[PDB]
Every structure is written in structure tokens, then in C-alpha cells.
Design an enzyme around this catalytic site. Structure first.
Site, PDB file in Angstrom:
ATOM      1  N   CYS A   1      55.840  31.179  24.780  1.00 17.57           N
ATOM      2  CA  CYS A   1      56.407  30.893  26.122  1.00 17.57           C
ATOM      3  C   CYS A   1      55.519  29.791  26.713  1.00 17.57           C
ATOM      4  O   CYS A   1      55.148  28.866  25.936  1.00 17.57           O
ATOM      5  CB  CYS A   1      56.516  32.185  26.930  1.00 17.57           C
ATOM      6  SG  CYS A   1      55.055  33.280  26.855  1.00 17.57           S
ATOM      7  N   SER A   2      55.060  29.883  27.961  1.00 17.47           N
ATOM      8  CA  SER A   2      54.053  28.890  28.424  1.00 17.47           C
ATOM      9  C   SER A   2      52.654  29.277  27.912  1.00 17.47           C
ATOM     10  O   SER A   2      52.001  28.403  27.297  1.00 17.47           O
ATOM     11  CB  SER A   2      54.053  28.662  29.931  1.00 17.47           C
ATOM     12  OG  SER A   2      53.337  27.443  30.222  1.00 17.47           O
TER      13      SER A   2
ATOM     14  N   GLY B   1      53.068  36.691  27.972  1.00 17.10           N
ATOM     15  CA  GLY B   1      53.996  37.443  28.848  1.00 17.10           C
ATOM     16  C   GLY B   1      55.352  37.716  28.201  1.00 17.10           C
ATOM     17  O   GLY B   1      55.566  38.825  27.605  1.00 17.10           O
TER      18      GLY B   1
ATOM     19  N   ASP C   1      63.166  31.870  36.632  1.00 17.78           N
ATOM     20  CA  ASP C   1      61.912  31.245  37.131  1.00 17.78           C
ATOM     21  C   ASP C   1      60.976  32.322  37.710  1.00 17.78           C
ATOM     22  O   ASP C   1      59.776  32.228  37.433  1.00 17.78           O
ATOM     23  CB  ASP C   1      62.210  30.148  38.166  1.00 17.78           C
ATOM     24  CG  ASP C   1      62.447  28.761  37.576  1.00 17.78           C
ATOM     25  OD1 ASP C   1      62.574  28.647  36.331  1.00 17.78           O
ATOM     26  OD2 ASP C   1      62.479  27.787  38.358  1.00 17.78           O
TER      27      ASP C   1
END
Ligand SMILES: O=C(O)CSc1ccc(Cl)cc1
Length: 284
Positions: free
Chosen positions: A215-216, A220, A181
Site C-alpha cells: 500500500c503506501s 495497514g 481516502d
């Protein structure tokens, strides 16, 4: 300059933040006019992450051809990648339309559906064999065929059916499930193990369309994946593997999508992955 020595030099000096900002300062800036049209506001997860017009993937429909996705084309390495955001509730159909139109064999997912107690992307694939998904907007059917769950990743066998022509294809879903996270993994061993599984599948090979990586935001973790792959491939191809400059590869990639590698810790992790991966690429 051997990157392993450059690495110890930056680490001992603690200048990761200063290297990272130099990259941000020299990175390419190109127009993203299509991404910013008012008709596309609900097709973008983040207001500050857009595909450049020159490199954007186009959907094959006259309606609206827009998706938040870019084609990264690495000429010397002979590799192509599509980097895209985590699909939204109203772009799940667009996502699978793109996978079909571009002839991709693999989808690489580097995030969980929920992280830090918030939704990072839509549940865009079926969880049970007998409960298939139908995307009515793009006329596609998606069925889960099999699922192999391991400690650091899960591989899924999916069937995508073009309901218009009744053709079907097998799509492999590579889901890296253990990126923390906050921060980056302590060791790159499990990330490198995952990249070699994607390679072994044929998903990164020129007999298929480009792999879809997300990814989101799609810059990144997604950045880290294609930078490490391309750097190791260049080290296997060139007469002098120590000529591979990771900062110059990252700037070349940033000509095709903004913001690739989001933090100084992701930049350091990318060095670590390439340095450790090279101890296989050079004959071990
Ligand atoms: O359509 C796909 O992706 C594969 S479906 C399948 C069914 C039975 C067996 Cl034995 C293997 C694949």
C-alpha cells in the site's frame, strides 16, 4: 471462542480501541539496524516503518542489498507473502529487481498513486502498450500487454525482461482501486471478491515465489490482505474452524514485520472479512 460471537461482544461493549492497544502492547520488537544506516535514508518512505533485520528481503547485488520489504512465512497455513512500501522514485528499479529475484507471479496494490491530494507511491508500471519502461540501474524492461478495468479493481498483464539474459516472464498486477481516502470499506464483499481473483490466478500458490503486496507504508491495508487470506486458509485446513484465533494470527505475522493493521477500524474490518468469507469456505 467463535470469532462471530467475540465480534458482537466487542461491538456491543465498544472496546475495539482496547483490543487493538493490547495487540500493540504484546507485539514483537526486533532490531532494524540495516534500515537505519545513513546510506539507506532515501530508500525509506517513512522514518517509523522499517523491516526487521531477521526477515528483510535482500537484493542480489554487492553494492547495497537494502529494500524496505519483509518475508512473512506462515508455517501452519503453508503461505508466504512479501510486504513492501509503495516504491519511491529512486527505488522503482530495486522493486522490479526483487520481483525478478524472488520469482513472484503477482503484485497486489491496495492504494492509488494520489490520495488526499498527495503522492502515495511512484507511477512504477507503463500506462500504454507502446511506451515501455527501462530501469537502467537494474537492467530490466517492463511492457504493458493488456488491461482489464472493472468497478472495484483493475488487472494488468505485464512482461518483465531481464535485459542481461533476455529471459521474460508474465507478471499479473492486481490493483484494488476503491479503498476510501479515510476509514475502511463499509462492506468487505468487494475486498473478498478481489482476494478470490488473486487466489484464482495462481499468484498465492507454492509453484511460484511469494506474492509482493504493498500500500503506501506496506503495513495497514497490506496487513488486512494477508491476515484475511491466512485466517480463511486455516479454517479450511483444521478439524475445528472455530479454533482460528485472528488476534494470535496477527501477533505471529507481527513477528516478521512491525505495525501490521494500523487502526482499530482496520482490525474490525479484518474480523468482518474473515466472518463473511467463512460463509463460502464452509461449503456455500
Ligand atoms: O509476456 C507476457 O507476459 C505475455 S505476451 C503475449 C502476446 C500475445 C499473446 Cl496472444 C499472448 C501473450
Amino acid at each position: 471462542m467463535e470469532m462471530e460471537k467475540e465480534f458482537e461482544q466487542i461491538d456491543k461493549s465498544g472496546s475495539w480501541a482496547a483490543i487493538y492497544q493490547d495487540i500493540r502492547h504484546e507485539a514483537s520488537d526486533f532490531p532494524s539496524r540495516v534500515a537505519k544506516l545513513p546510506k539507506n535514508k532515501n530508500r525509506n518512505r517513512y522514518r517509523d516503518v522499517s523491516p526487521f533485520d531477521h526477515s528483510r528481503i535482500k537484493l542480489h547485488q554487492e553494492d547495497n542489498d537494502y529494500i524496505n520489504a519483509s518475508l512473512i512465512k506462515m508455517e501452519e497455513a503453508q503461505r508466504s507473502y512479501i510486504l513492501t512500501q509503495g516504491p519511491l522514485p529512486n527505488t522503482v528499479g530495486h522493486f522490479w529487481e526483487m520481483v525478478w529475484e524472488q520469482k513472484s507471479r503477482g503484485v497486489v496494490m491496495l492504494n492509488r498513486v494520489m490520495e488526499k491530494g498527495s503522492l502515495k507511491c511512484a507511477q512504477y508500471w507503463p500506462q500504454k502498450e507502446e511506451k515501455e519502461m527501462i530501469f537502467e540501474d537494474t537492467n530490466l524492461k517492463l511492457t504493458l500487454i493488456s488491461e482489464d478495468i472493472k468497478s472495484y479493481y483493475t488487472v494488468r498483464q505485464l512482461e518483465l525482461e531481464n535485459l542481461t539474459t533476455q529471459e521474460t516472464r508474465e507478471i499479473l498486477h492486481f490493483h484494488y482501486t476503491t479503498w476510501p481516502d479515510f476509514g475502511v470499506p463499509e462492506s468487505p464483499a468487494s475486498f473478498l471478491n478481489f482476494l478470490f481473483k488473486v487466489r484464482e490466478s495462481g499468484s498465492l500458490s507454492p509453484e511460484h515465489g511469494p506474492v509482493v503486496v504493498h500500500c503506501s507504508a506496506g503495513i495497514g491495508r497490506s496487513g488486512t490482505f494477508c491476515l484475511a487470506d491466512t485466517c480463511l486458509l486455516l479454517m479450511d485446513k483444521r478439524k475445528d474452524p472455530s479454533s482460528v484465533d485472528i488476534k494470535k494470527v496477527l501477533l505471529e505475522m507481527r513477528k516478521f514485520r512491525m505495525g501490521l493493521i494500523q487502526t482499530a477500524d482496520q482490525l474490525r474490518f479484518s474480523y468482518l472479512a474473515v466472518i463473511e468469507g467463512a460463509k463460502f469456505i464452509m461449503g456455500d
